[PDB]
Design an enzyme around this catalytic site. Structure first.
Site, PDB file in Angstrom:
ATOM      1  N   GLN A 210      -7.258   1.907   8.677  1.00  0.00           N
ATOM      2  CA  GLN A 210      -6.061   1.863   8.133  1.00  0.00           C
ATOM      3  C   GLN A 210      -5.047   1.937   8.615  1.00  0.00           C
ATOM      4  OE1 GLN A 210      -9.204   3.626   7.676  1.00  0.00           O
ATOM      5  NE2 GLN A 210      -9.979   3.272   5.740  1.00  0.00           N
TER       6      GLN A 210
ATOM      7  N   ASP B 274      -3.359  11.750  12.021  1.00  0.00           N
ATOM      8  CA  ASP B 274      -4.645  11.194  10.854  1.00  0.00           C
ATOM      9  C   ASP B 274      -4.540   9.086  11.174  1.00  0.00           C
ATOM     10  OD1 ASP B 274      -3.791  10.267   7.600  1.00  0.00           O
ATOM     11  OD2 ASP B 274      -5.805  10.534   8.790  1.00  0.00           O
TER      12      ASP B 274
ATOM     13  N   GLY C  12       0.797  -1.502   0.366  1.00  0.00           N
ATOM     14  CA  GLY C  12      -0.003  -0.208   0.374  1.00  0.00           C
ATOM     15  C   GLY C  12       0.826   1.816   0.163  1.00  0.00           C
TER      16      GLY C  12
ATOM     17  N   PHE D 151       6.742  -5.455  10.891  1.00  0.00           N
ATOM     18  CA  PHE D 151       6.333  -5.894   9.742  1.00  0.00           C
ATOM     19  C   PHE D 151       4.623  -6.083  11.074  1.00  0.00           C
ATOM     20  CE2 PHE D 151       4.048  -8.915   7.399  1.00  0.00           C
ATOM     21  CZ  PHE D 151       3.222  -8.249   6.206  1.00  0.00           C
ATOM     22  N   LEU D 152       3.101  -5.735  10.772  1.00  0.00           N
ATOM     23  CA  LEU D 152       2.185  -6.736  11.667  1.00  0.00           C
ATOM     24  C   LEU D 152       1.472  -7.563  10.074  1.00  0.00           C
ATOM     25  CD1 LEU D 152       3.575  -4.680  13.658  1.00  0.00           C
ATOM     26  CD2 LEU D 152       0.947  -5.229  14.811  1.00  0.00           C
TER      27      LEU D 152
ATOM     28  N   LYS E   7      -6.980   6.330  12.151  1.00  0.00           N
ATOM     29  CA  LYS E   7      -7.474   5.647  10.608  1.00  0.00           C
ATOM     30  C   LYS E   7      -7.911   4.440  10.660  1.00  0.00           C
ATOM     31  CE  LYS E   7      -6.420   7.822   7.149  1.00  0.00           C
ATOM     32  NZ  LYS E   7      -4.625   8.049   6.953  1.00  0.00           N
TER      33      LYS E   7
ATOM     34  N   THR F 279      -0.316   8.865   2.246  1.00  0.00           N
ATOM     35  CA  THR F 279       0.110  10.285   1.841  1.00  0.00           C
ATOM     36  C   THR F 279       1.162  10.318   0.980  1.00  0.00           C
ATOM     37  OG1 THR F 279       0.285  12.136   3.698  1.00  0.00           O
ATOM     38  CG2 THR F 279      -1.642  10.851   2.989  1.00  0.00           C
ATOM     39  N   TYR F 280       1.869   9.742   1.951  1.00  0.00           N
ATOM     40  CA  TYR F 280       3.730   9.832   2.348  1.00  0.00           C
ATOM     41  C   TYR F 280       4.122   9.695   1.096  1.00  0.00           C
ATOM     42  CZ  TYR F 280       3.345  12.385   6.878  1.00  0.00           C
ATOM     43  OH  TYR F 280       2.226  13.774   7.994  1.00  0.00           O
TER      44      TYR F 280
HETATM   45  O1  LIG Z   1       4.064   6.475  11.287  1.00  0.00           O
HETATM   46  C1  LIG Z   1       4.792   7.082   9.812  1.00  0.00           C
HETATM   47  O2  LIG Z   1       4.541   7.086   9.287  1.00  0.00           O
HETATM   48  C2  LIG Z   1       5.579   7.826  10.991  1.00  0.00           C
HETATM   49  C3  LIG Z   1       6.807   8.776  10.115  1.00  0.00           C
HETATM   50  C4  LIG Z   1       7.127   9.809  10.620  1.00  0.00           C
HETATM   51  C5  LIG Z   1       7.978  10.709   9.202  1.00  0.00           C
HETATM   52  F1  LIG Z   1       7.949  12.046  10.133  1.00  0.00           F
HETATM   53  F2  LIG Z   1       9.366  10.325   9.918  1.00  0.00           F
HETATM   54  F3  LIG Z   1       7.521  10.353   8.420  1.00  0.00           F
HETATM   55  C6  LIG Z   1       8.083   9.538  11.639  1.00  0.00           C
HETATM   56  C7  LIG Z   1       7.322   8.915  12.878  1.00  0.00           C
HETATM   57  C8  LIG Z   1       6.448   8.714  12.263  1.00  0.00           C
HETATM   58  N1  LIG Z   1       5.184   7.062  13.415  1.00  0.00           N
HETATM   59  C9  LIG Z   1       6.446   6.239  14.652  1.00  0.00           C
HETATM   60  C10 LIG Z   1       6.599   5.249  14.378  1.00  0.00           C
HETATM   61  C11 LIG Z   1       7.266   5.370  16.234  1.00  0.00           C
HETATM   62  C12 LIG Z   1       6.754   5.993  16.802  1.00  0.00           C
HETATM   63  N2  LIG Z   1       7.537   5.836  18.616  1.00  0.00           N
HETATM   64  C13 LIG Z   1       6.025   6.849  18.894  1.00  0.00           C
HETATM   65  C14 LIG Z   1       6.553   7.001  20.789  1.00  0.00           C
HETATM   66  C15 LIG Z   1       5.814   8.426  21.003  1.00  0.00           C
HETATM   67  C16 LIG Z   1       5.354   9.223  20.194  1.00  0.00           C
HETATM   68  C17 LIG Z   1       5.579   8.755  18.531  1.00  0.00           C
HETATM   69  C18 LIG Z   1       6.557   8.004  18.350  1.00  0.00           C
HETATM   70  C19 LIG Z   1       5.973   6.626  16.313  1.00  0.00           C
HETATM   71  C20 LIG Z   1       5.777   7.772  15.902  1.00  0.00           C
END
Ligand SMILES: O=C(O)c1cc(C(F)(F)F)ccc1Nc1ccc2[nH]c3ccccc3c2c1
EC number: 2.7.11.22
Length: 269
Positions: free
Chosen positions: A114, A110, A9, A65-66, A112, A10-11
């Protein structure tokens, strides 16, 4: 590359990939700051998807991965419905994960179905954060739609309330296909907000005095099957005023979760 592929499967695009020199199967997200994204690798919680590696060269994000997401699971369960004990466990776990990142002043923005990943053990995890900053607007909080330029943690509680309702009724609560259609779908259900229920609403950038005035319906109509504990909690997650909207930590204390368990889902992978 260092991986063998398969698109899931917006960034950007997201791949199921295998690390050629560890055997590890991972989720590979290709995008198209660095110092703060990398702080997220160090922050982990059982209800947040783990960020393994950040790679800039294009921006690559390697996640654990899930196999399934909540949207696929709800569709698969659409004839029967997700059992209430499993709804409650998923809601409780999602609030746990939100309470964690909100305690670190990190917003999702965001949420959702999904973006909610599940496994065979009964866990559910927040993924696909909106942190880099056709789009689905169905879970957008009303203050975002009205053009507020400072989100608070309340926007994630709003989205989770919308997802809660959808698990219960097996239909999206507010399926708008434009910002104003989304706004008016909310208004028609919860009543057009005014200064009484939401002080300051009339001065938000996108508010129009010409919005139609709909009366509020009743929550017994909105999520019918749900008992009074769940309806009460949902009402507090869908308060218009972000200052009145329940926090994740307070939601965890709500009577709805007094009998919460952790059931195992039937997953077909
Ligand atoms: O989900 C994504 O696509 C995603 C994209 C970016 C980008 F800015 F680089 F794009 C950065 C992080 C992203 N996810 C993510 C992964 C692990 C995490 N652990 C956390 C602990 C405390 C609060 C938040 C998180 C947290 C968030």
């Amino acid at each position: 590359n260092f991986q063998k592929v398969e698109k899931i499967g917006t960034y950007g695009v997201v791949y199921k990939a295998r690390n050629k020199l560890t055997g590890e199967v991972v989720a590979l997200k290709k995008i198209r700051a660095i110092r703060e994204i990398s702080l997220l690798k160090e922050l982990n919680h059982p209800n947040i998807v783990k960020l393994l590696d950040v790679i800039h060269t294009k921006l690559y994000l390697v996640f654990e991965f899930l196999h399934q997401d909540l949207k696929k699971f709800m569709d698969a369960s659409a004839l029967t419905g997700i059992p209430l004990p499993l709804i409650k466990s998923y809601l409780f776990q999602l609030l746990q994960g939100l309470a964690f990142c909100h305690s670190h002043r990190v917003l999702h923005r965001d949420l959702k179905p999904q973006n909610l990943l599940i496994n065979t053990e009964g866990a559910i995890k927040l993924a696909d954060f909106g942190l880099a900053r056709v789009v689905t607007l169905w879970y957008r909080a009303p203050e975002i739609l009205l053009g507020c330029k400072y989100y608070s943690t309340a926007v994630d509680i709003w989205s989770l309330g919308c997802i809660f309702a959808e698990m219960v009724t097996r239909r999206a609560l507010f399926p708008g296909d434009s910002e104003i259609d989304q706004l008016f779908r909310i208004f028609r259900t919860l009543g057009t907000p005014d200064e009484v229920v939401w002080p300051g609403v009339t001065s938000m950038p996108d508010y129009k005095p010409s919005f139609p005035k709909w009366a509020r319906q009743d929550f017994s109509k909105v999520v019918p099957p749900l008992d009074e504990d769940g309806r009460s909690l949902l009402s507090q997650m869908l308060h218009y005023d972000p200052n009145k909207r329940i926090s994740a930590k307070a939601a965890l204390a709500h009577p709805f979760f007094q009998d919460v368990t952790k059931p195992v889902p039937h997953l077909r992978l």
